[PDB]
Design a protein around this ligand. Structure first.
Ligand SMILES: N#Cc1cccc(C(=O)Nc2cc(-c3ccccc3)nn2-c2ccccc2)c1
Ligand SMILES: N[C@@H](Cn1oc(=O)[nH]c1=O)C(=O)O
Ligand SMILES: N[C@@H](Cn1oc(=O)[nH]c1=O)C(=O)O
Lengths: 777, 123, 771, 123
């Protein structure tokens, strides 16, 4: 029912402006639209800045000559309804004229949602609008918001910078919070998308109004602390008032140091949010736009006095609120305060300038040049307003503004892109304690065009960084797999795999094939070396020495028997059988020596033949001698003495043919086998049935030999030598019958073979040659 | 913009009491301090009383101290002046003025002015 | 300047209706609308006019007061509706420096109603909506002057979640339209769905103004999500579903996947018109409202030449009948085949499925005005001075307390948030015959209870395949792992035979001595085995001992009976009896060992194997030494010497037994099986056997001397033969015993053979001499 | 409300030509079909020509068919009647009218009327 106050300045062209002079209405007061208290930087410096900027423009003959600029500043109160009311007041002149002077353009407001609300109304009347701090990502769609321009970039770059910051310090389990509205929602969406792409897990997401009460902030803080101590970092893409409410809640709950909140341009370097709550915000990292101070604004501003300022309707209330005084006789006196107001009070003390101030000034020049450019095209030679540009067209002004390009207050260049945005860069600020009860914001980094550079010795002042926000500790030691419960990728539990399994993938282990073992770091199953060499092994080599002794037993006996042909004992029996048995014993000893060798193909070529040929040939002499002894009348048609030799030759030929057939039935080759996972051995292939068959023939021959010896035992002949031989045959049969079953169950096949063959050869040789040797000696 | 109208003046006997009303047409009335002026023949227009925008602060001249009373009503947008124990020397024309952007009283910049009304005293 | 449909009266009520289609891309900056609409555009206007006439003809409701109207066009677009709202408020705006509007009915979309509500609440104008069902419009802190006669979208989300739960579609896709109607509904749907194990493959969004190219990429992505996710939840308007159907016809994907819709596509025949084949089988939810009958009678008698309240009607006649009127003021000569005089509006007539809500909103406003008039001035019949003008706040307070009966006979009343209760219906677009498709009522959702008729959907149990990322593999041993995309998507692998299942996400290995059961839940089995009498191989060995024992009896039979033999008489009978008893004990040793080697039996078994061989061999050494010494002498001395010799063996056995107590032990050779063996140390058997080595060597040493002088027949070389056979048996037993796992049958066979050869070799000459 | 003003009349000899213009105020000109009327002293008023709300189709009375033409212009919100081959019986007052809710011509239910314009033909 009562109109608000407006700050107006006369001129030929009138430009509107919406500034947040007062705080927004609190809950239980939004319906009446009752604003709060005045503001220092956001409300009262910007009004004076616009007034002085227009005054300076009016004194510039090069820019818009012979034209005067007026203005109307109104209060938006950081609220959508109040700003909508003021915009309706702006457009009421044109609305009535359709059925004072019209507004050609509007500067502001400063928040994204309020800017959208104002733009929706403004675009129907063709009024270009330029913002200076509304950096929402969805305001760049010219299909919906056509008459909107801004001298600042969108918040997509802010989201990218925040993602880079969290990536650099290895934050992987970070909580998130934003504020109601276009700005917070869009920025949090972008941050969530980029974090998901880069592999960062968010514990939970929360939203809250900056107008909420204490209970809401207390509940929010309790929810945030429910995730402690895992999520030690909170990404707060919210406004300054939300951060201040969080700090007040933290003080009320007695929490300090438990969180590291990372903010955005809403809380950039403002001392408003950390006044009286510095201890709750130490160590917080924030990001701000890059904008240096303006000096002539300070020169003009620091000399203003309440009794001589007749342009600002909100200045006496400002003076009283800031200095906590009351002006004695002034018209706008507030009697709430006391102690009156001194005449030596000055505005220089405790002065801090708005951090976006230059941006605002740019938003006032960007419009002006636009008009200038328009005046250079509609009326080329004329100076001043003309009939060709009366009234100013909204579409022509918009198309002239979209083409503008000039130099800013900081020396940079201002020019809009296809979406009506302007480039910019960012600074990374750190809030910390410098002295004793002294806190300040310290510039620690920069971000520009995708490049981030920060100094890490200024943050934390050491290399002991705050414990990184991780849901699970990295426990992959090269033998341990991580597994997921399906809730969050950053949360996992790690368990070992099998000892023979090597870690092929970071999520699973793979087992090696037979004959291969995992390496030191469980990456690569190289082939296990095969151990086959046994020449230097103690057990076989010593046996060879025994065989070597047997070699001497072959050499001495043969030499003595050869040179003793004249002896009747040697001439008593045929020398052919003795030579045959000596050759058989020698070949058996040679096979025993050759058994211990590398499993080459040539070695296994004769190993199968030698194992069976020597016992068969050597014991053929025994059966030949028994047949010759039985051929006599006492032993008993086959009276031929030489028939013994041909029978032995036939037997040897039959044995050789059987051996050759067995060899042809299966060719031998080196075969590698793996009896155990850690045991691999290389031996030439030899089937058990292949070995058994020659043994059966020799056993049958020995059994036939024993029958002949038993019948001939009683017959005395050649110094009772017929009583002998039988003992050797019995011992040979006993040792063979003992060897047959132990061979299958033995774990050292070749060792048992060589020992058995050597023992049989030695026993036969000795037990059959000792009596003749003694007789010769 | 506001338009100020005057009422309550006329002719009174000595020792009487009067109430003068100044009514402002137009909104934004609560953001304007108010003041009263009087002018008599052979003299110059001199202020008698003033009140701040929200009330609670009243200033009076040394001549009319203890006799005049200035009051406001923002619900109906009307400012009242009460004169008690009037004297024959107060016969003059009275004006009501609205001020903003001022200094310590009586150093005010009055944006708007009223019509004024004659007050006469008979002994 | 757009046209307006106005009706005079004492009180004027505004209205926003979507007579024309919204502006397309490249035509949105000029705010140039499309073609006329019938159900959403014109039936609404006619119904509002007729409802106002009916109210004005009713003496009970608002007597002696007439009601007017001012109907404008919102075009389903936000900017046009904002312009028309400015047209409403221009009267108040210029009066602050034509009768004012006291209330507004509409619009029908949430994203437009919000801006209309903001501008209207700036001027204290109550607003009642009939089709805006967004959840965020029920916040009276922000939208104070907003009321609606329909529920919110939370119940729609709950119904959709209930349906997808019932049909077990645990892996779906999602799509919604831009604006707070799609966004709020989709976010509520996913928030509810995340708590019942329902996973979303992907979520998309699109404008209704999007072109053909923009609608093709959406279908391409949806196809890329095939064949797993073939159910698509849609919080979309009618135009979005129409664009989806057109896109899938363009790319030829008819019938590839089912789609589930909301009240945006409820029963409207223009959503599936010329594209019925692409939309068969779809399931939609709609608000429950019966058809109003008295509206049809008024509507179906309207003709273009006698309707003087609707210009859009004269445009609509030509648009609908595809003809041009002869000489009317709105001829629109674009068409040919001039309109006939027999064209009725009752052919192919289908009524709007939201008419009762509009009528109820109008009646709610009228009843609120009536209550306000009654309260301010009771005894007057007309517009009293106490209500001149009309206060917006008083009207808003009166409207919140209004309850009455609607056209359907139910009761309409607002809650604390200005909403009104309602229920839902489940439809199913299907094919009834040949080239004939229709929506069929299937089920219902009401106050949390969903009842649906599944016999007429899919007509059988062979319904659509459940849209599932991964098929279940609960085989009892198969273990599941999640790669990291979505918990619904998983892959599973078999476990090891030794391992037993702990849960779905873990696999654990059993401890030693047990094997997993059939269900793999636990593992306690593989009991021990003995096979003392059930093994054929040892049994035969017992026979080898058994008859052998009988043979020993024969050796006792002749020797005890016969003593007249000089060879027997010369030899000591005590030594022969001792060695025979030792042989019998050796034979009985294997019989003791084979059967159940328990703790007590093993103690005797360990002593026995080292007792019988020791004493029998010791006696032989003494006998041979005495003969060699001859070539003291009393037989009593020999027995004492033998007893002293064996006492050493007994002492060694006792010392060994004390060091290692005999007890039952469990042996685990491999994981396959577990056996039981006695606690027999390697040294515990090495030491006693090595004792006989010196004893055996003594006989060999004494044998050489005794061979020189043979007396009393006897056997000289037989002792050497026995020693050689024993040595051969021992040498054969040494490697197999340390290599073979059993080491029992080998020992039994070796000891039986040793006893057999010892008895046979040195006794058969005496038997032959006796015989 | 829409206000109609017609002009272009005068004195024209027989066999000449003339052009009458009718201009309407407001911003809803394109939604109204237009018509011309002729009224002579001693008689009644008769319709002459008409045009639909968006041109396209025009209707003429059988008395003046072939001589008169009617046209619209929505850009500048005016309608034209070009009348040639003048005849002595055409001396009358011409009116310009608008309609929105009519039937087949000449039943159009007009709602706005112009002032009129005298046209006289000299023999
Ligand atoms: N030279 C020599 C030499 C070297 C080491 C050990 C033995 C030895 O004691 N043999 C033996 C003799 C008897 C035996 C049985 C009954 C009656 C008489 C004797 N049984 N055994 C036997 C030994 C090991 C496993 C199984 C059985 C002899
Ligand atoms: N970029 C912010 C602007 N802003 O928000 C604050 O709280 N301070 C401030 O400057 C927005 O888009 O609204
Ligand atoms: N509840 C919908 C209303 N609606 O949307 C359509 O497409 N048809 C229809 O009735 C909304 O709030 O927008």
């Amino acid at each position: 029912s009562e109109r608000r106050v407006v700050a107006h300045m006369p001129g030929d062209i009138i430009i509107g402006a919406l500034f947040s002079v007062h705080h927004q209405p609190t809950v239980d007061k939004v319906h009446e639209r009752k604003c709060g208290a005045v503001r220092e930087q956001y409300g009262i410096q910007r009004v004076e800045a616009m007034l002085h900027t227009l005054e300076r423009i009016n004194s510039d003959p090069t820019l818009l000559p012979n034209i005067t600029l007026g203005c109307e500043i109104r209060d938006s109160c950081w609220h959508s309804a109040v700003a909508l009311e003021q915009s309706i007041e702006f457009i009421r002149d044109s609305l009535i004229s359709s059925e004072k002077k019209p507004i050609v353009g509007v500067i502001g407001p400063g928040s994204s949602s309020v800017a959208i609300q104002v733009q929706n109304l403004l675009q129907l009347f063709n009024i270009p609008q330029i913002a200076y701090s509304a950096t929402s990502m969805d305001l760049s769609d010219k299909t919906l918001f056509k008459y909107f321009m801004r001298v600042v970039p969108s918040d997509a770059q802010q989201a990218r910078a925040m993602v880079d910051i969290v990536k650099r310090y290895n934050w992987t389990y970070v909580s998130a919070v934003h504020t109601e509205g276009n700005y917070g929602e869009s920025g949090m969406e972008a941050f969530k998308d980029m974090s998901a792409k880069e592999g960062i897990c968010i514990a939970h997401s929360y939203k809250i109004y900056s107008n909420a009460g204490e209970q809401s902030f207390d509940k929010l803080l309790k929810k945030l602390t429910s995730h402690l101590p895992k999520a030690r970092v909170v990404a707060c893409f919210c406004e300054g008032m939300t951060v201040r409410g969080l700090l007040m809640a933290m003080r009320r709950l007695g929490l300090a140091g438990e969180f590291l909140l990372l903010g955005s341009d809403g809380w950039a370097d403002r001392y408003d949010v950390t006044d009286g709550y510095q201890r709750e915000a130490v160590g917080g990292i924030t990001i701000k736009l890059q904008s240096p101070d303006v000096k002539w604004f300070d020169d003009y501003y620091l000399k203003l006095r309440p009794e001589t300022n007749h342009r600002n309707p909100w200045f006496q209330e400002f003076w009283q609120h800031r200095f906590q005084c009351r002006l004695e006789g002034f018209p706008q006196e507030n009697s709430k305060y006391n102690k009156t107001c001194n005449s030596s009070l000055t505005l220089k003390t405790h002065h801090v300038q708005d951090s976006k101030m230059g941006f605002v000034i740019n938003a006032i020049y960007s419009m002006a040049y636009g008009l200038h450019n328009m005046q250079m095209s509609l009326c080329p030679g004329y100076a001043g307003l003309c009939d060709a540009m009366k009234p100013i067209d909204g579409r022509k002004l918009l198309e002239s503004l979209m083409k503008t390009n000039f130099t800013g207050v900081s020396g940079d260049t201002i020019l809009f892109d296809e979406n009506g945005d302007s480039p910019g860069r960012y600074e990374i600020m750190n809030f910390k304690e410098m002295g004793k009860d002294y806190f300040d914001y310290i510039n620690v980094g920069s971000w520009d065009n995708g490049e981030l550079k920060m100094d890490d010795d200024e943050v934390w002042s050491k290399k002991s960084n705050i414990i990184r926000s991780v849901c699970s500790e990295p426990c992959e030691k090269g033998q341990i797999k991580v597994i997921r419960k399906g809730e969050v990728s950053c949360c996992w539990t790690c368990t070992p795999c099998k000892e023979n399994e090597y870690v092929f993938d970071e999520y699973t282990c793979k087992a090696c094939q037979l004959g291969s073992w995992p390496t030191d770091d469980l990456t690569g199953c190289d082939l296990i070396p095969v151990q086959y060499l046994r020449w230097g092994d103690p057990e076989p080599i010593a046996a060879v020495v025994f065989a070597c002794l047997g070699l001497l037993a072959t050499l001495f006996v043969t030499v003595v028997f050869i040179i003793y042909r004249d002896t009747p004992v040697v001439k008593s029996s045929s020398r052919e059988l003795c030579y045959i048995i000596l050759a058989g014993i020698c070949l058996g000893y040679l096979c025993t020596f050759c058994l211990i060798a590398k499993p080459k193909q040539i070695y296994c070529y004769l190993q199968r033949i030698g194992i069976g040929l020597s016992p068969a040939m050597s014991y053929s002499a025994l059966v030949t001698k028994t047949n010759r002894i039985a051929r006599i009348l006492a032993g008993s048609r086959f009276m031929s003495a030489c028939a013994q030799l041909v029978i032995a030759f036939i037997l040897i030929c039959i044995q050789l043919g059987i051996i050759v057939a067995l060899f042809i039935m299966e060719p031998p080759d080196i075969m590698h086998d793996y009896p155990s996972i850690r045991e691999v051995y290389l031996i030439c292939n030899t089937t058990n049935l292949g070995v058994v068959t020659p043994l059966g023939y020799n056993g049958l021959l020995i059994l036939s030999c024993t029958f002949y010896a038993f019948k001939t035992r009683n017959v005395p002949a050649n110094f009772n030598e017929a009583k002998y031989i039988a003992f050797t045959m019995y011992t040979t049969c006993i040792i063979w019958l003992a060897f047959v079953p132990i061979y299958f169950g033995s774990n050292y096949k070749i060792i048992t073979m060589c020992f058995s063959v050597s023992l049989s050869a030695t026993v036969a040789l000795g037990c059959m040659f000792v009596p003749k040797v003694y007789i010769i000696l | 913009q506001v338009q100020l109208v005057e009422s309550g003046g006329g002719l009174v006997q000595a020792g009487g009491s009067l109430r003068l009303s100044c009514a402002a047409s137009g909104r934004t009335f609560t953001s304007y301090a108010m003041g009263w002026f009087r002018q008599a023949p052979g003299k110059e227009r001199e202020s008698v009383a003033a009140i701040s925008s929200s009330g609670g602060s009243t200033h009076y001249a040394d001549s009319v101290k203890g006799r005049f009373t200035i009051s406001r009503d923002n619900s109906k947008n009307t400012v009242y002046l009460q004169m008690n124990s009037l004297k024959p020397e107060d016969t003059a024309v009275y004006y009501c003025a609205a001020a903003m952007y001022g200094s310590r009283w009586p150093d005010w910049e009055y944006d708007y002015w009223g019509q004024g009304t004659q007050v006469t005293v008979s002994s």
